[PDB]
Amino acid sequence: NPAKPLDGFRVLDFTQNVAGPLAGQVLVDLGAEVIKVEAPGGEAARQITSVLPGRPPLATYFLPNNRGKKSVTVDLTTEQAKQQMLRLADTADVVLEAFRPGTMEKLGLGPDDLRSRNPNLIYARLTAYGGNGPHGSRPGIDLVVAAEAGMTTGMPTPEGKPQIIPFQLVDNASGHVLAQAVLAALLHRERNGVADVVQVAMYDVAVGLQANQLMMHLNRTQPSDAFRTADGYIVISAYVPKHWQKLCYLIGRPDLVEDQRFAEQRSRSINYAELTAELELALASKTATEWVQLLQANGLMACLAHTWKQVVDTPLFAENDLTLEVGTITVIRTPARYASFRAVVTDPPPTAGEHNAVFL
Amino acid sequence: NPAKPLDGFRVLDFTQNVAGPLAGQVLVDLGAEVIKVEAPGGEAARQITLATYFLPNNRGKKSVTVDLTTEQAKQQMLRLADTADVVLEAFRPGTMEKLGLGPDDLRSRNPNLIYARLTAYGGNGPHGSRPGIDLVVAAEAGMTTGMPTPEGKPQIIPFQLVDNASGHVLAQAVLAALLHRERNGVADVVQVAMYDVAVGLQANQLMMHLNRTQPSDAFRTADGYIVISAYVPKHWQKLCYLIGRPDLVEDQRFAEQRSRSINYAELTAELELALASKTATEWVQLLQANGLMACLAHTWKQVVDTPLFAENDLTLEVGRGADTITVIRTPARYASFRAVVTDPPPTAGEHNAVFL
């Protein structure tokens, strides 16, 4: 019922898989009409399912990021689709595209093709590596882009194998950055009358996520770690003088405050190895849950390293109202929250080509 | 010279550390006037060196120095907010209210003011009231799951992904709010919790517990590891011929995609047997020439020197002539204007005279 930021805006979404569609989902949550353009028979990600005992399989990649969207089914190689897409684009505020560089141009749907017809059209491109040269022309997925951008650095594994982060951080981060860039473009148009071309590379996002560590190499705080306890590990960050002193008294080790090895913070960094040893000797007297309870009650930053299975059952997780029901299946909402409207949609994903008679 | 999306907008930035200032930096790049509010001595992050935390996210901002506990600074902030379009704040829940600078305090005076709050855990109740930093929020949101360590220690990701992702999400939400105000006349309160962002980055992994593909990994070679993803039927087949193992294509253990996943341990031994005859660099060259996804697992020291890194124009220089400092630009790019700034960070309190 209440107004949403993007009411009245129409988005043509050519993207597949996760990053581009998440950006589409963010736009939907903000009130835009987002029209998926899929290959005949539907997007391939519709078929990639996970087993749910006693129930139809769950399209774990497709369903969460295409709720409340509309769908047209079209074969982009034929002349008929080209014309339908050109007519559909004349009515659009935004085009979202995530093919590898050069594709849309070969189809006759490039930024120049579409923008010559519609001077108010915002054109947004998401690629793996940028399309700025020969090395950046390649297709990629999360796992390979993450590793090529350096995200395995400094994480030792038992076998000496590079550590591969087991969630799709580059995809999901890229989705939000693209959404950000579309929003900026919409504002640019609204205020200045300029309809822009926007480009986001997953590689650039990944580099950005590691910017501080990368920076030391562009130019030729303890205790803050996980620690053994009597039972399980505890994560503690207490390196600011007030917190550090507080910590030493709380674990029953006042001697550490004035120990010349640990008294100043720089000493804590140089003698970092000795410090974790002293802390773990002291932390041995309680379980991690007990230490977490004690340290938090005294205003120190500490927590358990929860597993995914544990996270979803914590009181904090329940408190933040992070889930929605899609008719039933449970999914996670987009992170940004607003007071004057709810940035969620209850609608299910569209069936493949559901709105062909409506838009073609 | 050319118009920028946020020309004419003024932002009041109370944020510290990485997450919030990154959002401010995006706003600067998009043309906004962003005014930092710092402690009298200057933000603490100015001193944590050389300055890996402060310099990259505060270029082109202006700076005022004030002690927020005093009534004089309180009044100065209230007058300044009367002129502002956006407030960015990243203290723990309840803090700004205690200073008399909460959303109702500021929005009562300025009905067009957008108020944006970045917290660690949300502030929606008792559990989400705590302060936090990247490392602790990441572990509490589940980001150590499924990563085995030599010593059995939980694996802590050594870069600030939750901070930097949160900044972009905040920037996104501020942009949405600006459009909301522009089109619907609503000046909103915006909230982004780092925990919520962290949950979102892991959404598919979390989702399996709310309701209920090979080869794609790193592999040993003669020298170094190679990362390969070739699990799609057409790609799987190409890989087998290129590494000299046509027998693997029809091998009952590996012929179907589901089989490769079940027998991934055997698959890995067979693949590494073949990959042992060449260096990782050699395999990357060969596999890419044939349209397969493969790369080295570069270190940070290596990434910066690659031809790919150079192609994408990812760095900018801060200062003039010699002894400039190199930083990384924000990722989104635009044709009608450059989302970059040359200007250096402000000195502590540099604009005290102009704003207070």
XYZ file of C-alpha atoms in Angstrom:
716
model
C 0.000 0.000 0.000
C 2.615 2.678 0.860
C 4.784 4.210 -1.871
C 8.085 2.536 -2.743
C 11.143 4.370 -4.129
C 10.943 2.830 -7.633
C 7.178 2.736 -8.336
C 6.562 3.263 -12.032
C 10.051 2.228 -13.187
C 10.376 -0.676 -15.606
C 13.466 -2.880 -15.741
C 14.396 -5.332 -18.498
C 16.472 -8.064 -16.836
C 18.581 -10.207 -19.222
C 20.774 -11.635 -16.404
C 21.212 -15.251 -15.259
C 22.538 -17.211 -12.267
C 23.090 -15.190 -9.061
C 24.800 -11.739 -9.166
C 22.659 -10.000 -11.804
C 19.402 -11.518 -10.574
C 20.124 -10.389 -6.971
C 20.415 -6.825 -8.259
C 17.082 -7.437 -9.961
C 15.620 -8.676 -6.668
C 16.809 -5.552 -4.842
C 15.058 -3.409 -7.452
C 11.876 -5.472 -7.068
C 11.971 -5.004 -3.295
C 12.196 -1.256 -3.913
C 9.074 -1.363 -6.093
C 10.308 -1.604 -9.689
C 8.572 -3.688 -12.333
C 11.344 -6.079 -13.338
C 10.889 -8.187 -16.453
C 13.099 -11.254 -16.849
C 14.094 -12.140 -20.397
C 14.691 -15.908 -20.593
C 15.645 -18.419 -23.267
C 12.748 -20.528 -24.628
C 11.698 -23.025 -21.975
C 13.089 -20.875 -19.165
C 16.393 -20.024 -17.501
C 18.637 -23.047 -16.869
C 18.922 -22.243 -13.146
C 15.240 -23.179 -12.772
C 16.229 -26.820 -13.197
C 19.180 -26.900 -10.771
C 17.360 -28.291 -7.738
C 18.124 -29.526 -4.197
C 16.340 -32.474 -2.534
C 13.644 -31.824 0.089
C 12.514 -35.115 1.720
C 8.782 -35.732 0.946
C 8.426 -32.572 -1.166
C 9.152 -31.291 -4.681
C 12.847 -30.282 -5.134
C 13.898 -26.694 -4.339
C 15.384 -24.521 -7.112
C 17.879 -23.165 -4.606
C 19.563 -20.759 -7.028
C 16.548 -19.519 -9.003
C 13.780 -19.061 -6.426
C 15.306 -16.658 -3.875
C 16.329 -13.951 -6.376
C 13.371 -13.832 -8.808
C 10.347 -13.344 -6.581
C 7.847 -10.758 -7.804
C 9.497 -10.608 -11.197
C 7.758 -11.035 -14.531
C 8.914 -13.275 -17.358
C 9.016 -13.239 -21.123
C 10.380 -16.155 -23.095
C 12.208 -15.339 -26.274
C 14.878 -16.699 -28.649
C 17.238 -13.750 -29.052
C 18.902 -15.015 -32.270
C 15.746 -14.690 -34.403
C 14.673 -11.386 -35.959
C 11.239 -11.568 -34.318
C 12.717 -11.472 -30.797
C 15.084 -8.639 -31.704
C 12.112 -6.515 -32.721
C 10.042 -7.465 -29.677
C 12.989 -6.629 -27.431
C 13.512 -3.312 -29.203
C 9.849 -2.422 -28.706
C 9.910 -3.603 -25.103
C 13.076 -1.555 -24.450
C 11.429 1.607 -25.814
C 9.170 1.365 -22.765
C 11.942 0.641 -20.259
C 13.818 2.811 -17.782
C 16.645 0.300 -17.269
C 18.255 -2.578 -19.118
C 20.301 -5.075 -17.034
C 22.669 -7.338 -18.940
C 25.282 -9.928 -17.885
C 26.407 -11.738 -21.034
C 30.120 -11.848 -21.789
C 31.430 -8.713 -23.608
C 30.313 -8.203 -27.215
C 27.229 -10.418 -27.061
C 24.450 -7.791 -26.911
C 26.139 -5.884 -29.687
C 26.100 -8.962 -31.967
C 22.395 -9.343 -31.181
C 21.784 -5.713 -32.117
C 20.754 -4.833 -28.564
C 23.856 -2.932 -27.482
C 23.773 0.355 -25.561
C 23.975 2.365 -28.815
C 21.219 0.315 -30.451
C 18.815 0.796 -27.562
C 19.775 4.312 -26.487
C 19.391 5.840 -29.964
C 15.718 4.853 -29.754
C 15.151 5.693 -26.065
C 17.115 8.735 -24.746
C 15.971 8.040 -21.154
C 17.243 4.459 -21.078
C 19.796 3.471 -18.464
C 22.018 0.602 -19.614
C 23.773 -1.575 -17.020
C 26.434 -4.247 -17.717
C 27.698 -6.897 -15.288
C 30.745 -8.942 -16.334
C 33.234 -11.299 -14.655
C 36.460 -9.496 -15.533
C 35.521 -6.165 -17.116
C 35.779 -6.468 -20.878
C 38.522 -3.840 -20.927
C 40.977 -5.986 -22.882
C 42.011 -9.538 -23.855
C 42.527 -10.829 -20.286
C 39.162 -9.489 -19.128
C 37.008 -10.908 -21.929
C 36.586 -14.343 -20.346
C 33.505 -15.761 -18.659
C 33.943 -16.678 -15.005
C 32.095 -17.870 -11.959
C 32.348 -16.850 -8.263
C 34.925 -19.474 -7.275
C 37.418 -18.689 -10.051
C 37.031 -14.900 -9.895
C 37.552 -15.010 -6.095
C 40.778 -17.009 -6.482
C 42.088 -14.967 -9.388
C 41.523 -11.767 -7.328
C 43.550 -13.118 -4.406
C 40.950 -14.305 -1.900
C 42.807 -17.518 -0.995
C 45.766 -15.561 0.409
C 47.018 -16.309 3.932
C 44.640 -19.103 4.890
C 46.534 -22.297 5.697
C 44.839 -25.633 5.019
C 45.965 -29.099 6.257
C 47.112 -30.375 2.832
C 48.683 -27.090 1.677
C 45.735 -26.605 -0.663
C 44.533 -23.051 -1.346
C 41.581 -22.183 0.877
C 38.428 -21.820 -1.205
C 35.735 -19.798 0.561
C 32.605 -22.011 0.489
C 30.021 -19.260 0.016
C 29.436 -17.014 -2.980
C 30.615 -13.705 -1.596
C 31.707 -12.255 -4.925
C 28.330 -12.953 -6.556
C 26.254 -11.523 -3.740
C 28.502 -8.497 -3.236
C 28.481 -7.855 -6.997
C 24.690 -7.903 -7.010
C 24.485 -5.158 -4.397
C 27.097 -3.001 -6.162
C 25.224 -3.265 -9.457
C 21.978 -2.344 -7.691
C 23.800 0.607 -6.151
C 25.002 1.684 -9.593
C 21.537 1.436 -11.133
C 20.159 3.537 -8.268
C 22.842 6.180 -8.813
C 21.993 6.230 -12.520
C 18.257 6.615 -11.819
C 19.063 9.570 -9.555
C 21.412 11.055 -12.143
C 18.591 10.926 -14.663
C 16.030 12.275 -12.203
C 18.039 15.322 -11.218
C 20.356 16.075 -14.113
C 18.561 14.663 -17.145
C 21.471 12.342 -17.945
C 20.779 8.693 -18.903
C 23.992 6.762 -18.291
C 25.838 3.574 -19.156
C 26.838 1.663 -16.048
C 29.445 -1.129 -15.788
C 30.272 -3.432 -12.878
C 32.960 -6.146 -12.938
C 32.915 -8.993 -10.407
C 36.696 -8.869 -10.395
C 36.637 -5.163 -9.481
C 34.241 -5.895 -6.638
C 36.457 -8.712 -5.331
C 39.545 -6.500 -5.447
C 37.502 -3.872 -3.627
C 36.557 -6.279 -0.840
C 40.282 -6.878 -0.186
C 41.344 -3.255 -0.690
C 43.202 -2.733 2.627
C 45.343 -5.858 2.274
C 45.934 -5.206 -1.416
C 47.106 -1.689 -0.646
C 50.297 -2.586 1.232
C 51.513 -4.202 -1.996
C 50.513 -1.225 -4.187
C 52.982 0.941 -2.308
C 56.553 -0.344 -2.538
C 45.569 -5.431 16.759
C 45.705 -8.078 19.479
C 43.971 -9.822 21.151
C 41.544 -10.233 18.239
C 41.216 -13.857 17.199
C 39.717 -17.251 17.973
C 40.947 -18.975 21.153
C 40.780 -22.454 22.684
C 38.680 -22.862 25.788
C 37.664 -25.876 27.873
C 34.973 -26.649 25.324
C 34.884 -25.157 21.848
C 36.461 -21.979 20.552
C 35.671 -18.394 21.497
C 36.172 -15.359 19.279
C 37.384 -12.289 21.216
C 38.289 -8.757 20.195
C 39.659 -6.676 23.060
C 42.676 -4.710 21.883
C 41.663 -1.190 22.968
C 43.395 -0.431 26.320
C 40.132 -0.237 28.328
C 38.997 -3.544 26.805
C 42.352 -5.284 27.162
C 42.629 -4.382 30.867
C 39.034 -5.411 31.397
C 39.796 -8.752 29.688
C 42.856 -9.530 31.838
C 40.919 -9.012 35.072
C 37.929 -11.034 33.823
C 39.987 -14.137 32.948
C 41.756 -14.010 36.308
C 45.082 -12.713 35.024
C 45.845 -9.210 36.426
C 49.568 -9.897 35.923
C 49.107 -9.534 32.165
C 48.160 -5.847 32.396
C 51.664 -4.874 33.554
C 53.667 -7.719 31.949
C 56.301 -5.945 29.817
C 55.533 -8.339 26.943
C 51.892 -7.298 26.690
C 51.420 -3.970 28.494
C 51.512 -1.765 25.372
C 49.564 -2.685 22.222
C 52.601 -2.699 19.925
C 54.132 -5.267 22.281
C 50.982 -7.343 21.927
C 51.505 -7.421 18.155
C 55.226 -8.294 18.281
C 54.718 -10.889 21.029
C 51.412 -12.080 19.574
C 52.371 -15.743 19.794
C 53.196 -15.669 23.510
C 49.936 -13.804 24.207
C 47.544 -16.406 22.738
C 49.403 -18.974 24.827
C 48.825 -17.039 28.046
C 45.174 -16.361 27.194
C 44.390 -19.979 26.383
C 45.999 -21.148 29.649
C 43.515 -18.844 31.385
C 40.519 -19.588 29.138
C 40.825 -23.295 29.949
C 38.762 -22.836 33.160
C 35.399 -22.371 31.406
C 33.468 -23.417 28.306
C 33.307 -20.913 25.444
C 29.582 -20.362 26.061
C 30.368 -19.406 29.655
C 33.137 -17.023 28.601
C 30.853 -15.451 25.973
C 28.157 -14.821 28.574
C 30.722 -13.285 30.955
C 32.587 -11.137 28.455
C 29.429 -9.734 26.847
C 27.886 -8.868 30.217
C 30.952 -6.674 30.740
C 30.819 -5.020 27.342
C 33.525 -6.939 25.522
C 33.298 -8.149 21.932
C 33.087 -11.943 22.000
C 31.039 -14.718 20.388
C 30.938 -18.387 19.428
C 31.950 -19.286 15.892
C 28.495 -20.572 14.944
C 27.904 -23.036 12.133
C 25.238 -22.306 9.523
C 22.995 -24.843 11.265
C 23.410 -22.986 14.568
C 23.031 -19.476 13.137
C 19.448 -19.947 11.965
C 18.381 -20.988 15.469
C 20.003 -18.169 17.478
C 17.804 -15.562 19.228
C 19.661 -12.822 17.350
C 18.723 -14.358 14.011
C 15.091 -14.595 15.066
C 15.210 -11.017 16.326
C 16.246 -9.531 12.954
C 13.294 -10.962 11.045
C 15.563 -12.264 8.322
C 13.241 -14.780 6.638
C 10.181 -14.776 4.350
C 7.682 -17.433 3.284
C 7.141 -18.060 -0.422
C 4.093 -20.161 -1.306
C 5.705 -23.292 1.315
C 9.437 -22.319 1.244
C 11.667 -20.163 3.504
C 14.127 -17.625 2.079
C 16.332 -14.784 3.357
C 15.437 -11.111 2.737
C 17.717 -8.427 1.279
C 19.709 -6.654 4.029
C 18.765 -2.946 3.797
C 15.721 -1.843 5.850
C 13.471 1.269 5.625
C 10.932 2.841 7.970
C 8.354 4.132 5.467
C 7.950 0.884 3.483
C 8.860 -2.810 3.661
C 11.671 -3.754 1.256
C 10.208 -7.211 0.648
C 7.813 -8.874 -1.766
C 5.570 -11.858 -0.996
C 4.897 -12.899 -4.624
C 6.421 -16.134 -5.943
C 8.760 -16.228 -8.932
C 7.096 -16.088 -12.382
C 6.669 -19.244 -14.454
C 8.842 -19.244 -17.574
C 7.315 -16.931 -20.189
C 4.289 -16.195 -18.005
C 3.848 -12.707 -19.453
C 4.486 -13.345 -23.146
C 0.945 -12.322 -24.120
C 1.328 -9.292 -21.873
C 4.651 -7.942 -23.167
C 5.447 -9.498 -26.559
C 33.012 19.657 -15.041
C 30.272 17.268 -16.144
C 27.219 16.898 -13.884
C 27.335 14.242 -11.134
C 24.371 12.331 -9.629
C 24.714 13.905 -6.188
C 25.683 17.534 -7.048
C 24.220 19.869 -4.418
C 23.584 17.223 -1.748
C 25.243 17.568 1.649
C 26.133 14.571 3.830
C 26.983 14.562 7.554
C 29.292 11.576 8.214
C 29.612 10.446 11.864
C 31.087 7.057 10.896
C 34.400 5.461 11.890
C 36.612 2.569 10.797
C 35.855 0.956 7.426
C 32.185 0.185 6.727
C 30.552 3.619 7.128
C 33.377 5.733 5.660
C 33.406 3.505 2.558
C 29.751 4.439 2.067
C 30.731 8.081 2.461
C 33.497 7.617 -0.106
C 31.019 6.225 -2.631
C 28.850 9.295 -1.979
C 31.907 11.544 -2.545
C 32.661 9.792 -5.866
C 29.059 10.386 -6.924
C 29.487 14.117 -6.314
C 28.130 14.707 -2.794
C 29.505 17.105 -0.229
C 30.464 14.778 2.609
C 31.464 16.299 5.960
C 33.303 14.118 8.475
C 32.580 14.690 12.175
C 35.628 13.669 14.201
C 36.817 13.560 17.797
C 38.866 16.646 18.859
C 42.206 14.877 18.360
C 41.142 13.645 14.935
C 39.742 10.166 14.232
C 41.732 7.348 15.863
C 41.981 5.595 12.490
C 44.282 8.428 11.366
C 46.990 6.895 13.567
C 46.619 3.144 12.907
C 49.494 2.643 10.440
C 51.064 3.753 6.741
C 47.346 4.371 7.476
C 45.872 1.267 5.810
C 42.439 2.067 7.240
C 41.891 5.837 6.947
C 43.318 7.064 3.631
C 41.390 4.860 1.167
C 37.907 5.861 2.378
C 38.109 9.582 3.159
C 39.464 11.271 0.037
C 37.586 14.428 -0.950
C 35.665 14.690 2.304
C 35.608 17.807 4.486
C 36.378 17.726 8.202
C 35.064 19.284 11.383
C 36.346 18.574 14.891
C 33.920 18.631 17.855
C 33.434 16.958 21.264
C 29.927 15.474 20.958
C 29.301 15.291 24.715
C 29.349 19.074 25.158
C 26.253 21.213 24.641
C 28.213 23.537 22.368
C 29.050 20.776 19.873
C 25.494 19.497 20.245
C 24.108 22.850 19.114
C 26.628 23.155 16.296
C 25.618 19.715 15.020
C 21.936 20.623 15.185
C 22.510 23.758 13.120
C 24.627 21.855 10.600
C 22.014 19.097 10.224
C 19.446 21.766 9.301
C 21.438 22.191 6.079
C 22.052 18.509 5.391
C 20.296 16.031 3.134
C 21.721 12.883 4.738
C 23.059 11.823 8.091
C 25.354 8.769 8.218
C 25.850 7.217 11.627
C 27.589 4.039 12.806
C 27.629 4.109 16.627
C 26.044 1.232 18.544
C 22.245 1.501 19.095
C 21.030 4.239 21.444
C 24.220 6.309 21.282
C 23.047 9.192 19.066
C 19.807 9.358 21.020
C 21.793 9.856 24.243
C 23.629 12.781 22.623
C 20.341 14.362 21.580
C 21.216 13.737 17.922
C 18.890 10.808 17.180
C 16.570 10.529 14.158
C 13.655 12.194 15.989
C 15.919 15.002 17.258
C 17.232 15.844 13.798
C 14.111 15.022 11.770
C 11.929 17.144 14.051
C 13.942 20.153 12.855
C 14.574 19.022 9.264
C 11.661 17.044 7.712
C 13.658 16.472 4.501
C 16.570 14.811 6.325
C 17.492 11.217 5.491
C 18.864 9.362 8.480
C 21.020 6.293 7.850
C 22.162 3.938 10.619
C 24.866 1.313 10.292
C 25.134 -1.065 13.229
C 26.799 -4.385 13.949
C 23.712 -6.441 14.766
C 20.653 -4.320 13.983
C 19.411 -2.832 17.233
C 16.018 -4.505 16.914
C 16.181 -5.856 20.452
C 18.477 -6.891 23.321
C 20.615 -9.344 21.307
C 21.339 -6.897 18.525
C 22.414 -4.066 20.769
C 26.109 -4.914 21.017
C 29.008 -3.148 19.304
C 31.027 -5.287 16.894
C 33.797 -5.316 14.336
C 34.138 -7.227 11.042
C 35.951 -10.231 12.491
C 33.487 -10.928 15.304
C 30.318 -10.288 13.315
C 31.619 -12.572 10.540
C 32.176 -15.461 12.991
C 28.844 -14.934 14.734
C 27.028 -14.906 11.368
C 28.554 -18.281 10.491
C 31.412 -17.435 8.137
C 33.869 -19.982 9.585
C 31.690 -22.945 8.599
C 33.197 -25.728 6.472
C 36.773 -24.469 6.426
C 39.200 -26.957 8.029
C 42.378 -25.599 9.590
C 45.731 -27.340 10.307
C 45.400 -26.770 14.075
C 41.592 -27.219 14.220
C 41.112 -23.491 14.818
C 38.079 -21.802 13.225
C 39.134 -20.204 9.947
C 39.080 -16.404 10.089
C 38.963 -14.708 6.712
C 41.901 -12.246 6.736
C 40.222 -9.403 4.829
C 37.339 -7.207 5.863
C 34.632 -8.500 3.570
C 31.767 -7.788 5.980
C 32.901 -4.165 6.457
C 33.355 -3.480 2.731
C 30.176 -5.286 1.652
C 28.259 -3.364 4.345
C 29.519 -0.023 3.065
C 28.218 -0.738 -0.420
C 24.874 -1.875 0.919
C 24.566 1.298 3.026
C 25.493 3.416 0.013
C 22.837 1.541 -1.981
C 20.213 2.184 0.707
C 21.138 5.879 0.938
C 20.789 6.098 -2.867
C 17.365 4.425 -2.685
C 16.297 6.873 0.044
C 17.395 9.856 -2.053
C 15.265 8.586 -4.938
C 12.349 8.022 -2.522
C 12.539 11.615 -1.309
C 12.950 12.852 -4.879
C 9.924 11.032 -6.336
C 7.542 10.433 -3.419
C 8.496 13.238 -1.041
C 9.443 10.837 1.747
C 12.591 11.392 3.806
C 13.261 8.007 5.400
C 15.145 6.336 8.219
C 17.478 3.751 6.733
C 19.013 0.816 8.616
C 21.745 -1.630 7.634
C 23.133 -4.231 10.024
C 26.482 -5.843 9.283
C 25.088 -9.133 10.581
C 22.232 -8.953 8.038
C 24.720 -8.326 5.242
C 26.849 -11.251 6.409
C 23.752 -13.462 6.524
C 22.912 -12.332 2.956
C 26.364 -13.177 1.587
C 25.812 -16.761 2.818
C 22.128 -16.934 1.907
C 22.101 -20.237 -0.076
C 24.105 -22.042 2.607
C 21.772 -20.787 5.371
C 18.705 -21.611 3.321
C 19.301 -25.354 3.331
C 18.822 -25.408 7.106
C 15.691 -23.258 6.949
C 13.952 -25.860 4.763
C 15.582 -29.332 4.807
C 29.584 -29.853 -8.589
C 32.842 -31.334 -9.867
C 35.405 -30.612 -11.143
C 35.378 -27.184 -9.499
C 38.292 -26.797 -7.069
C 42.031 -26.264 -6.640
C 44.364 -29.001 -7.883
C 48.012 -29.902 -7.375
C 50.292 -29.567 -10.413
C 54.047 -29.916 -10.974
C 54.603 -26.391 -9.628
C 51.812 -24.721 -7.668
C 48.063 -25.225 -7.577
C 45.648 -24.528 -10.419
C 41.997 -23.585 -9.933
C 39.735 -25.259 -12.502
C 35.985 -25.162 -13.038
C 34.847 -27.501 -15.826
C 31.787 -29.401 -14.635
C 29.444 -28.589 -17.502
C 29.341 -31.641 -19.883
C 30.960 -29.800 -22.825
C 33.651 -28.434 -20.477
C 34.234 -31.702 -18.614
C 34.935 -33.458 -21.925
C 37.360 -30.819 -23.222
C 39.304 -30.963 -19.944
C 39.728 -34.749 -20.130
C 41.193 -34.608 -23.656
C 43.419 -31.619 -22.886
C 44.981 -33.287 -19.822
C 45.400 -36.459 -21.890
C 42.750 -38.630 -20.234
C 39.945 -39.551 -22.711
C 39.183 -42.602 -20.544
C 37.714 -40.401 -17.817
C 34.868 -39.223 -20.094
C 33.189 -42.636 -20.177
C 34.476 -43.896 -16.794
C 31.337 -45.041 -14.926
C 32.672 -43.221 -11.878
C 32.882 -39.804 -13.540
C 30.740 -39.776 -16.701
C 27.700 -38.095 -15.108
C 27.837 -34.892 -13.070
C 26.272 -36.450 -9.980
C 28.819 -39.268 -10.139
C 31.735 -36.830 -10.185
C 30.363 -35.236 -7.049
C 29.941 -38.542 -5.205
C 33.350 -39.849 -6.253
C 35.125 -36.485 -5.956
C 38.043 -37.968 -3.993
C 38.866 -40.527 -6.693
C 38.319 -37.848 -9.361
C 40.864 -35.582 -7.684
C 43.499 -38.334 -7.606
C 42.952 -39.050 -11.320
C 43.073 -35.348 -12.244
C 46.200 -34.659 -10.190
C 47.897 -37.707 -11.737
C 47.456 -36.036 -15.126
C 48.188 -32.470 -13.980
C 51.533 -33.561 -12.494
C 53.211 -33.471 -15.954
C 53.023 -29.660 -16.290
C 53.463 -26.449 -14.330
C 50.308 -24.553 -13.220
C 51.132 -21.621 -15.502
C 51.411 -23.991 -18.479
C 48.010 -25.561 -17.772
C 46.364 -22.165 -17.388
C 47.696 -21.036 -20.758
C 46.466 -24.260 -22.430
C 43.050 -24.464 -20.768
C 42.199 -20.791 -21.394
C 43.192 -21.070 -25.053
C 40.438 -23.677 -25.302
C 37.741 -21.690 -23.489
C 37.906 -23.295 -20.032
C 37.684 -21.538 -16.658
C 41.080 -21.821 -15.005
C 43.484 -19.565 -13.107
C 46.324 -19.474 -10.610
C 45.473 -18.910 -6.952
C 47.307 -15.580 -6.839
C 48.520 -14.006 -3.603
C 47.825 -10.300 -2.932
C 51.465 -9.579 -3.818
C 50.932 -11.370 -7.131
C 47.468 -9.943 -8.015
C 48.746 -6.395 -8.203
C 51.274 -7.280 -10.906
C 49.011 -9.264 -13.264
C 48.076 -7.984 -16.750
C 44.416 -8.354 -15.819
C 44.815 -6.037 -12.845
C 46.469 -3.444 -15.065
C 43.682 -3.680 -17.693
C 40.958 -2.629 -15.287
C 42.520 0.666 -14.177
C 41.874 -0.144 -10.520
C 44.280 2.257 -8.842
C 44.496 6.001 -8.420
C 47.309 8.187 -7.063
C 46.892 10.463 -4.040
C 49.017 13.674 -3.853
C 51.100 15.230 -6.633
C 54.344 14.424 -8.478
C 56.602 12.250 -6.323
C 55.797 10.248 -3.190
C 52.116 9.819 -4.024
C 50.233 6.984 -2.350
C 48.364 4.333 -4.356
C 44.809 3.269 -3.487
C 41.998 1.269 -5.102
C 38.962 2.956 -6.699
C 35.337 1.998 -5.971
C 34.119 -0.746 -8.345
C 31.156 0.801 -10.252
C 31.982 2.741 -13.462
C 29.989 5.311 -15.451
C 30.226 6.714 -18.976
C 28.847 10.230 -18.405
C 31.201 11.112 -15.538
C 34.238 9.752 -13.677
C 33.325 8.240 -10.290
C 36.727 9.154 -8.923
C 38.340 11.999 -6.992
C 41.940 13.221 -7.013
C 41.570 15.382 -3.880
C 43.411 14.189 -0.701
C 41.791 13.537 2.686
C 41.044 16.594 4.829
C 43.302 17.419 7.772
C 41.681 17.094 11.194
C 39.303 20.008 11.726
C 40.257 21.619 8.406
C 36.771 23.052 7.902
C 35.963 24.036 11.486
C 35.805 27.679 10.412
C 33.472 27.105 7.461
C 30.886 24.946 9.212
C 30.648 25.629 12.947
